RNA sequence: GGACGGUGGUCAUGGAAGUCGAAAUCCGCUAAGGAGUGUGUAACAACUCACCUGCCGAAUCAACUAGCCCCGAAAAUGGAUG
């Protein structure tokens, strides 16, 4: 897998875009219309981790947004808890309501059938 | 488990919980995921589980004779045949039939790559065709045994041909000349050793269950009452118009060899 | 001989991403299946391994204590415990 990170709706940065190849394997400004065509939607906010797959003159991209980013979206807090296990540095407390539908996106991905197991993964990551 | 410091780990309490098990589920049917992957197993195990369920455990799996200790049969390691648990089998208890557990398990297996080393269960064969690839180590192909040639600037394979036989081991070289290929020949689940319900005790050989010999033996028998119906002259609906004629065939017939003109 | 997915683990830093250094070690999906034991490339790239299983079949391992021996142990005209 090889990491990207985004912003919601960036194109074409020269740091992001350039030293970690620009995707289709040659042309950035494809992979830079296509992330963008996608992950334009609401405002760049937190980010997502971003994961690259490389074939004979195309990109894709895997999103979903990436756990640590369901949490971040749902929380709305950009950064992970600092001082660990115990006591955030940001104030990241997220509800029980937000940890279910998030683990129901999740439900295919976590391979699941129930929601009091796929809540326990997310509940352990989310306090780690 | 989770629990990786010494605290059980259980004898007698996982047994226990087996032991009801066995007592709560008509049919017992002991099997083989050893050829599966991890993945392959819980989605094969995901099917079972809606139905009714199956555990593993190890030397408290044998432990059908405590059940058999509990009621009165014979699925145990006194009464049984020979044991017919093997190494890396599991216990899958259910509701459901025998024959369409067999089915089940059997009829739908997954398949998955050959790997080297292994006993190849089944035979293995390439068919005959361009492999798409540019030139390179053809050669590589002709040391498995597989003979092939470039044709229009491409690898090609020359004919199908078994490359290993079953029961017979594939070589480190086979089998990655085989992945290259994109060939999945081996198909893997849980195998079947053994089925117990009801006092009775089934082997593979009884739970891979024919089924078209019968339709041939069921229209053959039905011919068998048929033919007895047509030539007997016993009418009830069937049987009765084909009766008939026989009075009159062998009237029409009379006249075939003859020497009367009427 | 078996190890899917969350997820190219959070920090930090050209850089870890199992494998410089430091959180943290849960679970779905599971019969077994640790956010990993040592080998990697500047960095990207694979293989094994925790646990679990077979084959094998009977003792194994840990630890205290003690004896003798062994070691430490090189010198002068020629070898000995008389």
């Known amino acids: 897998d090889v990491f990207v990170r985004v912003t919601g709706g960036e194109v074409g940065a020269a740091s992001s875009l350039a030293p970690k190849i620009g995707p289709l394997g040659l042309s950035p400004k494809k992979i830079g219309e296509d992330i963008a065509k996608e992950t334009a939607k609401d405002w760049k906010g937190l980010r997502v981790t971003v994961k690259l797959t490389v074939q004979n003159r195309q990109a894709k991209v895997s999103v979903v947004p990436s756990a640590a980013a369901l949490v971040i979206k749902a929380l709305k807090e950009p950064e992970r808890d600092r001082k660990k296990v115990k006591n955030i540095k940001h104030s990241g407390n997220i509800s029980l309501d937000d940890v279910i539908e998030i683990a129901r996106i999740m439900r295919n991905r976590s391979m699941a059938k129930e929601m009091a197991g796929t809540v326990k993964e997310i509940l352990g990551t989310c306090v780690s | ?262």
């Open chain 2, 1 to 262: 488990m989770a629990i990786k410091r010494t605290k059980a780990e259980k004898k007698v309490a996982y047994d226990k919980k087996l032991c009801q098990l066995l007592d709560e589920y008509t049919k017992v049917l002991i099997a083989v995921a050893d050829n599966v992957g991890s993945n392959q197993l819980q989605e094969i195990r995901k099917g079972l589980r809606g139905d009714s369920i199956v555990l593993m455990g190890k030397n408290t799996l044998i432990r059908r004779c405590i059940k058999v200790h509990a009621d009165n049969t014979g699925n145990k390691e006194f009464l049984e045949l020979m044991p017919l648990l093997v190494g890396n089998v599991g216990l899958i208890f259910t509701k459901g039939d025998l024959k369409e557990v067999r089915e089940e398990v059997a009829k739908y297996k997954v398949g998955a790559p050959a790997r080297v080393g292994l006993v190849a269960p089944v035979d293995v064969v390439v068919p005959p065709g361009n492999t798409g690839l540019d030139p390179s180590q053809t050669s590589f192909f002709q040391v498995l045994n597989i003979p092939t040639k470039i044709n229009k600037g491409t690898v090609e394979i020359i004919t199908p041909v078994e490359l290993i036989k079953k029961g017979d081991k594939v070589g480190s070289s086979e089998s990655a000349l085989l992945a290259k290929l994109g060939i999945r020949p081996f198909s893997y689940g849980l195998v079947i050793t053994n089925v117990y319900d009801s006092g009775s005790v089934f082997s593979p050989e009884v739970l891979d269950l024919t089924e078209d010999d019968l339709m041939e033996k069921f229209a053959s028998g039905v011919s068998m009452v048929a033919s007895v119906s047509l030539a007997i002259s016993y009418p009830t609906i069937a049987a009765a118009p084909h009766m008939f004629l026989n009075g009159y065939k062998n009237v029409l017939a009379v006249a075939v060899e003859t020497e009367y003109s009427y």
